[PDB]
Design a protein around this nucleic acid. Structure first.
Lengths: 128, 192, 48, 70, 158
RNA sequence: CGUGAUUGCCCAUUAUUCCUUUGGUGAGGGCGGCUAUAUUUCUUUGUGAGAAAGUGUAGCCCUCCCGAUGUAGACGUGGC
RNA sequence: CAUAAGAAUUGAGGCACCAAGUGGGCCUUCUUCGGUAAGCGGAGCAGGCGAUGCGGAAUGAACCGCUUAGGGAUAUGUGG
RNA sequence: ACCGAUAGCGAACAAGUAGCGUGAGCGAAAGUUUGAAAAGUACUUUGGAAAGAGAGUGACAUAGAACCUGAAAUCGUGACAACGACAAUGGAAGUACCUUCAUUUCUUUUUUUUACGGCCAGACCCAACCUCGCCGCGCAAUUUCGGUUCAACAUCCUUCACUGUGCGGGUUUCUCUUUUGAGGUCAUGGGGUGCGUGAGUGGGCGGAAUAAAGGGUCGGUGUGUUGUGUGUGGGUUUUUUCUCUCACUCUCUUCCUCCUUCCCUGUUCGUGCGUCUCGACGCUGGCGAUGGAAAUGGGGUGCCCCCACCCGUCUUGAAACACGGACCAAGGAGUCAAACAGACGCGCAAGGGAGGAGUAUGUAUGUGAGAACUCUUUUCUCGUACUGAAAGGGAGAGUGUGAUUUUACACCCGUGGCGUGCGCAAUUUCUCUUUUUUGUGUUUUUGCCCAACGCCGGCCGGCCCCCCGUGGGCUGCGCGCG
């Protein structure tokens, strides 16, 4: 998922570290998620995305129209971040030719877990 | 990895490949199902839905409680709209209290003989919903009567740790004096 | 799938058509940059 | 073989099945019962009042049918 | 299994503690109420009446009542799968108004007052800054770290 | 020099993806007395051939979607 | 409902009817009592097992991984 | 609207027999030739004899008196071209063998295999993700002793090292300066096909851009400058003088030793060019295999690989060294049924249910139908107010109204919270309609529930010193628009 970041929200994530990997997406990547697993949730129905009209159909409403608004809205937020995100259908990535290993736990403190930050892209990319 | 369902495969609840043995209904529903959805009318849909339930779930309604409804007309408008449409998916039973009450139009499943007549006779109109709908598509100056529910007796027979909070009558065997009711109506034995 | 891709960025076809600037363009940069920093470089110098 | 007593485990799991309820708490209004009688006496006198508001629910009805019935 | 008084004691809780002994203040009594107050519960000791059982200190509930000496607080007590409201008969001496709520409202009005002022009252009027950020830096003397053992003969355990 | 030989891997009912299945408080639709909708497919960069070509299409059919191990125990059958 | 400054969620919520099947558990991280002890006894929390199999630990109820429609294609898991 | 020979009575049978037990008593087992019948196999012939083999009968003796059928367990046989480290049957998988099924078929038909828009995925090939900054490099320099040689000296430098000079040419920015960009890399697929109505294959010529250039223009920044000024704090400064500048900070300086916006002056790149494009859809073909026999596809056995613990059950835990379980037939266990709660269909609805009965007239056996049809006056019965032990009372304490509401009047919603709804306005289009959408209104608590009176019986009889009236005031399976 995408996350808006402010202190609690920094905090819920703060606790959860060896169960998650998280970090700082990249525009490339973001776009790319936007390709790979691009879906919206549409009165339910999980539907891989298609076009900026639907996007508008959902998000004309924050005068978003297209994914480049969306990505923009990702990188550059809007605080329609929420709004945008919530109508997403949840992203499901891939097995990634780069296991986690060391029997889990954080990157330095294990495997991998915790914040891969910029290294998330690096990581994520083999995973999408 | 699936995860919590808030209850899995969501329960009958309000129901679907549906209920009772009267033929007509079966039509009705076909008729109406188009109408609410595909003649975009909450009222219709409602109707449609409302049609669907079971008998309890269609416990009747009766007339004087409609009187009021036709006091509503009366505090409605000066009166450009000057007409009004009652619905009941049950039988309309007669009431009693008034029974000199005016005429008017009621759209019901069934009107008792007596009622039917007398209503109609009083200038009323008993229209069946075929006799409604058709010639009544879309609401507006419609009046859903959603029946009642409550005043059944059954619920009476819900409650018995007879604390000062619970005041409710059991399904027991005294139909007269004692026979399971010896105190409470005295404070003392087996307390409260 | 240029089409949906193109839905999503229409500059993209023309980008693609023109590599978003190929090779000559891609080899040209450094060399300016390299002198340029030296010009910048050069300025502070004496004023230390 | 010592024959164990009882316990609490599973319970928050059980308790969380059916959750942790409060009920719309202040129902919209209270659950009734009790108080300080001198206050309770007084509150009835300001609910006397209710027959006043029933003639305010009739005031409007009369206004609509005396302004014009057209 | 254990013994049960409805006032069954404790080690170090009820006991009236650190110089905190003795009667409630007159300030305590000068207080004033209304109902619906969200007030929190504490136990003096003082009089062993109007005094809740254990649940209750450190809990916030709402008063529903004011009686001569005392006040009624309904509290939600968590049982099984729920919290039940319990209405408890304290004399006034064992309860007090928080700030829990106070702020929220306080701010809310104050803010509204400002929000309103800002449009639609006269003036206009800066407050705060955003959150947290980046920055230019012209520092002027960094250090590092070299830890333990050098000049350890000056220090460390024996 | 500046990387680069160049491509470190092997292998669960998990995962992806994809199909078929199935259920679902699931989504669509077509649901007309010739405009249309399924079946079968050409001539095969911008075709329903209403007329190229056979066949089906009365409230269901035709597309869509999420989910889909479960003892005890329960319920269901346009189940046997 | 802005800050000028500090959520996220919310694949519904509300709300209810009524009947079952169960009451010997057992296993575990963690805390902890009895006693030298004990694969011992005895509690506290969470999780399991039980009541699930699949994949891993030459061997294992509870360890690892992971749970399961039926498949297909792909890649991983633990583990090599 | 029963059972079907283990059923069904005990007993279909010379059965309550036989049998059994001292006796009391206990008390079984046990069914069918003939399309028609004994026509019940003469005769021959072997065979002691049975018998056999013949014959002979009869549709049928796979009907010969064991008679309808003739199930399974168990076994001989035939037949086997079936197999064996040794668990045994077992999964899964494929082959072999197969008795195998069903399907389709060529001189314009099938079949295995090549091949194929756009697709519809996946893999190769080169470009780049920038950059301030060191790093260094160079020079010199100090310190700084090492290889040469037999060693020392040369060769203070092998060099590590330092220090200074000087330089900006030169690696870092790793599968972190993107995890960037497309070029065909043509190998891989686990194929692939069908809306349509049609503006339109609209578009696609700029667009991009390191940048060189040019500054300029204003704008962002480190500094020297403080140009301050502000901040004043310390000293043997009460104060004043004097000393320390420390802390800050203003413009300033535009100091920049510094960015950037713009705008010019380059370059690039592609589309341009031209407007045609076009980017919104391959059962086919080529390979080989009857011409009525086959062949593609399906069944069976064996065999090999791998996989893989006796069921049931009780338990915390059963593959255990827990129990029960040699085999096959036929048996063999959740029933009827009151009041009653829910659910649901079902009837009618304040009534409903008769109900007991009884009458009742032909269909014609009968008849003037528990069961046919009913059919029903009397009603009966339960239901359509409750409350009190009682004695006993008892609900629009309507609403409203007057009301000093004993009363008396009037006579189409008790009080509030909610309400699918209905109304209004704004709101989109639509002529208008339609009317999307907006914005609100409003309305019985029988639509639900809540929340409060109110109301019946009830109880205390209040208020007060006691008691009565304005009026109370506790309580209940009650009542609140059938």
């Amino acid at each position: 998922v995408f996350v808006r970041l402010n202190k609690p929200m920094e905090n819920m994530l703060r606790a959860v570290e060896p169960y998650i990997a998280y970090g700082y997406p990249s525009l490339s990547t973001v776009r790319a998620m936007v390709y790979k697993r691009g879906h919206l949730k549409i009165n339910g129905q999980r539907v891989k995305i298609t076009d900026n009209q639907m996007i508008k159909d959902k998000y004309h409403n924050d005068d978003i129209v297209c994914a480049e608004d969306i990505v923009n809205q990702i990188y550059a937020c809007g605080k329609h971040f929420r709004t945008v995100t919530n109508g997403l259908w949840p992203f499901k990535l891939a097995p990634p030719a780069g296991g986690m290993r060391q029997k889990r736990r954080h990157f330095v403190e294990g495997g991998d877990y915790g914040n891969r930050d910029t290294l998330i892209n690096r990581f994520l990319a083999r995973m999408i | 990895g699936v995860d919590l369902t808030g209850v899995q495969k969501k329960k009958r609840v309000v129901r679907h490949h549906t209920y009772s043995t009267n033929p007509y209904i079966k039509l009705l529903i076909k008729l109406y199902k188009f109408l609410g959805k595909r003649t975009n009318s909450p009222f219709n849909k409602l109707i449609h839905k409302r049609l669907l339930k079971s008998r309890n779930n269609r416990a009747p309604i009766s007339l004087s409680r409609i009187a009021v409804c036709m006091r509503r007309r009366t505090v409605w408008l000066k009166k450009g709209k000057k007409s009004p449409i009652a619905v009941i998916v049950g039988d309309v039973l007669d009431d009693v209290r008034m029974t000199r009450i005016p005429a008017l139009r009621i759209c019901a499943l069934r009107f008792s003989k007596s009622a039917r007549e007398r209503i109609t006779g009083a200038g009323g109109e008993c229209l069946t919903f075929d006799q409604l709908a058709m010639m009544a598509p879309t609401g507006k100056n419609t009046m859903l009567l959603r029946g009642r529910k409550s005043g059944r007796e059954s619920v009476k027979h819900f409650g018995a740790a007879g604390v000062p909070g619970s005041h409710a009558k059991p399904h027991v065997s005294s139909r007269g004096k004692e026979r399971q009711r010896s105190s409470k109506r005295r404070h003392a034995f087996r307390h409260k | 799938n240029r089409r949906l891709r193109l839905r999503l960025n229409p500059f993209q076809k023309k980008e693609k058509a023109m590599a978003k600037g190929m090779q000559n363009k891609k080899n040209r940069e450094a060399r300016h940059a390299a002198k340029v920093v030296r010009l910048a470089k050069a300025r502070k110098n004496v004023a230390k | 073989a010592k024959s164990k007593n009882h316990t609490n485990h599973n319970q928050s799991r059980k308790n969380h099945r059916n959750g942790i309820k409060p009920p719309l708490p202040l129902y919209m209004y209270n659950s009734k019962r009790g108080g300080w009688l001198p206050a309770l006496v007084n509150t009835r006198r300001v609910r006397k009042n209710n027959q006043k508001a029933a003639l305010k629910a009739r005031r409007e009805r009369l206004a609509a049918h005396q302004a014009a019935q057209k | 299994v254990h013994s049960h008084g409805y006032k069954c004691g404790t080690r170090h809780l009820f006991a009236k503690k650190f110089r905190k002994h003795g009667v409630p203040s007159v300030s305590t009594i000068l207080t004033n109420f209304k109902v619906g107050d969200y007030v929190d519960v504490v136990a003096d000791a003082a009089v062993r009446a109007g005094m809740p059982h254990k649940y209750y200190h450190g809990r916030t509930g709402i008063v529903w009542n004011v009686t001569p000496r005392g006040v009624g607080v309904i509290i939600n007590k968590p049982v099984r799968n729920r919290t039940v409201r319990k209405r408890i008969c304290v004399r006034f001496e064992h309860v007090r108004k928080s700030r829990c709520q106070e702020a929220f409202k306080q701010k809310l009005k104050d803010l509204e007052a400002f929000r309103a002022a800002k449009k639609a009252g006269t003036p206009l009027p800066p407050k705060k800054v955003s959150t947290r950020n980046g920055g230019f830096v012209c520092p002027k003397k960094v250090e590092v770290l070299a830890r333990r053992t050098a000049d350890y003969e000056a220090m460390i355990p024996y």
